[PDB]
Every structure is written in C-alpha cells, then in structure tokens.
Amino acid sequence: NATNVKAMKYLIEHYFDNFKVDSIEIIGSGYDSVAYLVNNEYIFKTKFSTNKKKGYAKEKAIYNFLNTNLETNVKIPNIEYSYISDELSILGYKEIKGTFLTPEIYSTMSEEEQNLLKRDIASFLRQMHGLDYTDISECTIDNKQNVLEEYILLRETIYNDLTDIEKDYIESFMERLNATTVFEGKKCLCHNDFSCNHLLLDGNNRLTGIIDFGDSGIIDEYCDFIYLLEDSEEEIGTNFGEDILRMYGNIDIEKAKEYQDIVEEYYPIETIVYGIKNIKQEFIENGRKEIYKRTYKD
Ligand SMILES: Nc1nc2c(ncn2[C@@H]2O[C@H](COP(=O)(O)OP(=O)(O)NP(=O)(O)O)[C@@H](O)[C@H]2O)c(=O)[nH]1
Ligand SMILES: [Cl-]
Ligand SMILES: [Mg+2]
Ligand SMILES: [Mg+2]
After folding, report:
1. Which domains does the chain have, with CATH numbers?
2. CA 255 to CA 247: how far, in whole Å?
3. CA of 215, closest atom in ligand 1
4. Which of 129, 202, 207, 218 could, after both became Cys, cross-link 120 (CB 3.0–4.6 A)?
5. What residues sit around ligand 4, an ion, with C-beta below 5 angstroms?
6. Which ligand does the CA of 91 lie closest to?
C-alpha cells in the first residue's frame, strides 16, 4: 500500500508547485483510476494512460460548465488543480463532506425523511436536465450509435469465436435495440452515472452533494434514472426510482423502465467490449460467463 501513495504524493507536489502533502490515503478505485484523500481536505482523482485519451479533460470541462450555470444548494466538485497529459491526468478539488447514501441508511429513515430525499433528488435532476447546454455541446453522447460501433468492433475481432449461446444473446439484444423507441426522446445534460454511491447526505439525511460527473454528457433524459430504477443490493430499489420519476414529472415512466432494462441487458456485452478495447482478457471472460448466468437464470 505504502508505495502508491508515495508516488502519487511525489506527482502532486511535482505538478502543483506550492502544494504540500501532509497526509494522503487511497479513498477509492476504479479499474483504471485511483482517488486519494489528501490533507483530510482534498480529493485527487488520478489516471494513467487509458483507452479514453481526453477523459479527465471532459470531466473538468463539465465541472467548469456546471459551476458557472447551476443554481442549487447541492454541492459538486469544484476543480482547483488540474494536470492533463496523454499519459497522466490529475484532478483535485475540496472534498465534499457527508455520508454516502446506502440501502441500509435509507431503511432507517422515516417515511417523511425518505420523501424529502426523493424530492431533493428530483429537484436536482430537474435543474440539471433543464440547463441550456449550448456551451457544453461538444459533450454529446449517442448511446445507440455507440452500441452499433461496439458491435462492429466485436464482429471485427472475437465474434466468430464466441459460442452459439453467446452469439444468440448478442443478436437478440441487437434485435431489441433495433425495435425500441427509447432513444428517440428528449436529450439533455445528464450526470449519466447517477447511483447512490455518488450521492452524499448531510446530518439530517438530506441531499448535500453529488460527485463523479465523469461520464456526463448530452444524452437521453432516461439515463439519469437507470440506477434509481435498479433492483440490486447496491441500489435502493424500483419503488424509489418510480417515486422520484413521479416527483420529477413530465416523463414516461414505462419508457424509463424500458431504457433501464435495455441498458441492463447490454451490460455483459459492454463488459466484453471493455476487455477487447483495453486488452484485458479477464473482462472478456467475465462478460461471456455473465451471458450464461443470465441465460440459465430463466
Ligand atoms: N466524501 C467524499 N468522497 C468523495 C468525493 N469525491 C470522491 N470521493 C470518494 O472517492 C471515490 C472515487 O471518486 P469517483 O469520482 O467516483 O471516481 P471513480 O468512479 O473511482 N473514477 P472514474 O470517475 O475516473 O471512473 C468515491 O466513491 C468516494 O469514495 C467527495 O467530494 N467527497
Ligand atoms: Cl474469454
Ligand atoms: Mg465513481
Ligand atoms: Mg466516474
């Protein structure tokens, strides 16, 4: 453990001239990134060269757009330090304080407390989705088209070596993609990774902050409800998402649910594609195995 922290302490002090690191610890990890808590006050997100070459550049541009344009009391990262290169990216901002929302915490809240949290979420999403996004228009994301391009990459690489069961799962997904209408609705600026591990509560169990706008862009409005609708151990549950949708208003709930169900079906394929793009066999195997689990569940 000691070694990572030392290298990262060195890089921070090297790229940010007057910054002194008095303490540093690992606070989180993705597959190709690490986050550190520094001086018990700053979050530094860091990444070495990955397949997404403009990754922390976009995230920084989004925080800068949002800190200029959002009217909200909910806090989000405000970037004070940034170093962006092909081989290394670092973003630093003052840590937003609070407690991450979990299913367990939610279940100890009174009905009224739950309602106020749902209302806070709806209001935040309303305010973000209603922004004029002209000034961030470079951050457009077309999920259908992205899926079609990932399918082409499969066909060019490993598709012919898959099993019939794997091929059928993929083709059956592509048929559903082609018949659906859920990519044809309102587009807006979405957080696009809006799960409860990115939502911070204050001491009264009200929403106080939101982190990780790394995947944000102009995309289907239904995107920000994918995790709120999700039934799993990590998320609160379908009822929670449904109530938030009703409070948010002027959105077709059945379509939001169809969008979530399609994204969920895609997950194993998305996992396979990640493995191909990043040359990680482990992800290709995991996604293929998950196809079998889903096929045999019923
Ligand atoms: N309390 C607190 N924790 C934070 C804050 N920013 C980041 N974290 C912590 O650091 C973890 C990683 O941050 P996050 O932005 O989600 O990055 P990531 O998802 O690991 N990486 P990437 O966004 O590049 O895929 C979060 O799960 C959380 O533990 C913050 O402002 N406050
Ligand atoms: Cl494999
Ligand atoms: Mg995250
Ligand atoms: Mg992220």
Report:
1. 5-94 (3.30.200.20), 98-298 (3.90.1200.10)
2. 16
3. 23
4. 207
5. 212, 214
6. 1
Give whole-number Cα distances, 109 to 113, 116, 167, 206, 230, in Å.
6, 10, 45, 10, 20
Testing ligand 1's pocket by substitution, the residue of 24, 27, 96 carrying the most ligand atoms inside 8 A of its CB is: 27
Instruction: Choose among 33, 35, 55: nearest CA to 44.
Output: 35
User: Could you give the angle at which helices 253-277 and 143-156 cross, rounded to 10 degrees?
Assistant: 30
Q: How far apart are CA 228 and CA 235, in angstroms?
A: 7
Residue with tokens 């541009």: 61
> What would the two tokens of residue 77 be?
């990262």
Angle separating helix axes 238-248 and 253-277, nearest 10 degrees? 120
Kindly state the DSSP code that residue 30 receives in the 8-state scheme.
-
Please identify, by atom number, the ligand 1 atom nearest to the C-alpha of residue 34.
20
